[PDB]
Amino acid sequence: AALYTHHQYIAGFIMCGAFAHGAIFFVRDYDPAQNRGNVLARILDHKEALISHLSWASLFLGFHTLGLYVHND
């Protein structure tokens, strides 16, 4: 139990750090002129689709998992 929980918490923190440093890359080291038309620019182009679909997936999962738990309860 100790080893599993230890490595799981370590992994969670490291994932948060990976995303934090991706954000820092975008704020600091991202050059639109060099990265023009590549997959990085293209994924910045339609960010609203990504954010809205993450929002839908999370809303669905939360609504339904909570609803089933509450119904059973």
Partner 1 sequence: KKVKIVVDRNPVATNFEKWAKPGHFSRTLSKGPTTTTWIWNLHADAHDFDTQTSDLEEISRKVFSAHFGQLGIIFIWLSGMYFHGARFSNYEAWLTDPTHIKPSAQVVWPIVGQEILNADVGGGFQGLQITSGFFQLWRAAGITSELQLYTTAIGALVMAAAMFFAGWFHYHKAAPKLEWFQNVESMLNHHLGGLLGLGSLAWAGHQIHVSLPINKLLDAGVDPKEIPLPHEFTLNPELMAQLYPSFSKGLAPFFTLDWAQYSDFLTFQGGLNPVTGGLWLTDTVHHHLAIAVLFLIAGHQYRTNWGIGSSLKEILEAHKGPFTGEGHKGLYEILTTSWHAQLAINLALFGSLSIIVAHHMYAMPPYPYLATDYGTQLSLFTHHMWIGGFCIVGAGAHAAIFMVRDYDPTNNYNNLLDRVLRHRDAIISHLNWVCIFLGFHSFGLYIHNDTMSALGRPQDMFSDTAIQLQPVFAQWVQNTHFLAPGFTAPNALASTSPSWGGDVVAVGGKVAMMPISLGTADFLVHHIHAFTIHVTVLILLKGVLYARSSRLIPDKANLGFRFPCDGPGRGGTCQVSAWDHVFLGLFWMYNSISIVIFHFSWKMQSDVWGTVSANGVSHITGGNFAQSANTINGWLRDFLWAQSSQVIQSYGSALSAYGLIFLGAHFVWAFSLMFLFSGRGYWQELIESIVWAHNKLKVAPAIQPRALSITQGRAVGVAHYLLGGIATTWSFFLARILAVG
Partner 2 sequence: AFTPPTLQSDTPSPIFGGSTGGLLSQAQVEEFHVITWESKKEQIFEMPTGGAAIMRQGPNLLKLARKEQCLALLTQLRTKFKIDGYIYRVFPNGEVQYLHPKDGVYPEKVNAGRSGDNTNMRRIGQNKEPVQIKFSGKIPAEF
Partner 3 sequence: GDFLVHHAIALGLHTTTLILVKGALDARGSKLMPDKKDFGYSFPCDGPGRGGTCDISAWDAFYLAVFWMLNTIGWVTFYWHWKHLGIWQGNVNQFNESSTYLMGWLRDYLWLNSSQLINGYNPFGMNSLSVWAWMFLFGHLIYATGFMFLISWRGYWQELIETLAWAHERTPLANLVRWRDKPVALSIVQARLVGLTHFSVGYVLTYAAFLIASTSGKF
Using CB under 8 A as the criterion, which residues of the chain lie in contact with partner 1 when the complex forms?
47-48, 51-52, 55-56, 73
Provide, rounded to whole angstroms, the least separation between the CB of residue 53 and partner 3. Answer: 9
Q: Angle at the Cα of 44 (from 38 to 45), degrees rounded to 5? A: 85
How many other CB atoms are there within 10 angstroms of residue 40's CB atom?
A: 16
- Residues 50 and 43: beta-carbon distance below 8 Å: yes
Residues interacting with partner 3, by CB under 8 A? 1-2, 4-5, 8-9, 11-13, 15-16, 19-20, 22-24, 26-28, 30, 43-44, 47, 50-51, 54-55, 57-58, 61-62, 64-65, 68-70, 72-73
